């Protein structure tokens, strides 16, 4: 009954964009034939799906999404736990150094050293990596959303992907041992903080100690 | 062009046309007289 509930839910809100046979309207939507359940999971769970594009709240909730995914697959899969739930902690890896090297070579050019945002050309940008979970990161690098290259499982193995997932989950949630994180970027916030705090306090001390006329 | 603080003197204020009564004093009688004709 998954294939049945999937089509009805798809025919209501998805055929308008892509098509009756999931082949792609020349103006509205893409083909969607070769994509698996992973693209359906990512795009729907991140709220990027049905649209007129930042992340938002999903409309379908964890059962309709699975039915639509099974339907689109029936015409890249998501990873599940041996109990049928979606994997959350199983996707983490143990080689943080390898994950970090791979991230700095493949991913840091667009997001950041530590998964902050990045600017792209003429509008578009790369988002922050904090509000994404492990399955969302996996499906993101498996399907390659807009302007993001698609990383095949044959060019970037599953174990390397798990190491990268572990590395980003550590780089997004570890406490800074040096004081207040000034935004995660380099010396631009540091120069701002310098001019606004240190020099202001020094000049105020000079005004207090010295005279004026 | 009014000066800073807007005034170097003020006239007597008897109605809602004080400048009119100031510049035409031969008219205050004829103003109070024929006002309620309608």
């Amino acid at each position: 009954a998954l294939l049945r509930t999937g089509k009805q839910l798809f025919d209501t809100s998805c055929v308008s964009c892509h098509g009756a046979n999931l082949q792609g309207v020349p103006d509205h939507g893409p083909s969607l034939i070769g994509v698996g359940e992973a693209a359906v999971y990512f795009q729907v769970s991140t709220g990027r799906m049905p649209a007129m594009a930042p992340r938002k709240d999903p409309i379908f909730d964890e059962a309709q999404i699975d039915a639509i995914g099974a339907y689109v697959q029936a015409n890249p899969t998501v990873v599940r736990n041996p109990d049928g739930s979606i994997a959350t902690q199983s996707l983490r890896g143990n080689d943080l150094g390898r994950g970090g090297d791979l991230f700095r070579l493949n991913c840091a050019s667009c997001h950041n050293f530590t998964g902050k945002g990045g600017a792209l050309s003429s509008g578009k940008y790369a988002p922050d990596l904090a509000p994404a979970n492990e399955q969302q990161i996996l499906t993101a690098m498996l399907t390659g959303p807009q302007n993001m290259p698609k990383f095949s499982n044959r060019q970037l193995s599953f174990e390397a992907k798990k190491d990268i997932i572990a590395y980003v989950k550590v780089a997004t949630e570890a406490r800074q041992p040096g004081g207040y994180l000034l935004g995660g970027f380099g010396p631009a916030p540091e120069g701002m903080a310098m001019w606004i705090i240190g020099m202001v306090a020094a000049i105020g001390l000079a005004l207090w100690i010295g005279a004026r006329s | 062009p009014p000066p800073r603080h807007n005034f170097t003197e003020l006239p007597r204020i008897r109605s809602e046309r004080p400048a009119f009564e100031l510049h035409y004093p031969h008219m205050v009688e004829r103003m109070r007289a024929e006002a309620h004709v309608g």
Binding site: G100, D101, R104, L105, A108, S109, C110, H111, N112, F113, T114, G117, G118, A119, L120, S121, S122, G123, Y125, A171, Q176, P177, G178, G179, Y180, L181, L182, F185, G186, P187, A188, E190, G191, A193, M194, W195, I197, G198, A201, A202, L205 | -
Partner: protein, 165 residues
């Protein structure tokens, strides 16, 4: 003050980076703020190159030339000003900035030029945090660099004369 802010604020966390490798890159840039004007000049200068017989003059030569020209013009200002104004006297009393409008406007113009070059160095951070296009920020810097300093000059001149009045 230095101890407080060296204890409470994190600066240059090298471990979040990695060791340098010629194949990796990040959206990170922008040297320390006192070198940012050279970076911004390199970012907003237009690509003007010259090709003649088996030779090449690339575009960053302009950046190097402007840098050296600033480095030369900075220590020469007292002599340039005394030549222009014709004032060769001894001075022990200071001037109030409002009483020297031309020099105050020159200095304000130079500070405006420096500030434009320093803001042009954080193109990507500005475009990301304040929702502006990257091409837009580049062109904004490129046009401000030429049209803002004289505007600041004019305003500074009139402002000093108003303080005098």
């Amino acid at each position: 003050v230095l101890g407080l802010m060296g204890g409470l604020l994190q600066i240059n966390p090298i471990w979040n980076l990695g060791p340098y490798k010629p194949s990796q890159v990040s959206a990170g840039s922008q040297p320390d703020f006192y070198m940012m004007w050279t970076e911004g000049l390199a970012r907003i200068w237009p690509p003007w190159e010259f090709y003649f017989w088996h030779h090449t003059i690339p575009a960053p030569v302009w950046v190097a030339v402007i840098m050296g020209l600033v480095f030369v013009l900075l220590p020469a200002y007292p002599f340039l000003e005394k030549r222009f104004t014709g004032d060769y006297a001894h001075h022990n009393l200071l001037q109030r900035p409002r009483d020297v409008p031309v020099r105050t406007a020159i200095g304000a113009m130079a500070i405006a030029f420096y500030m434009v070059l320093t803001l042009a160095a954080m193109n990507d951070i500005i475009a990301l945090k304040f929702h502006i296009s990257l091409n837009a920020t580049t062109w904004i810097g490129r046009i401000g660099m030429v049209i803002l300093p004289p505007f600041v000059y004019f305003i500074t001149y009139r402002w000093c004369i108003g303080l005098q009045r």
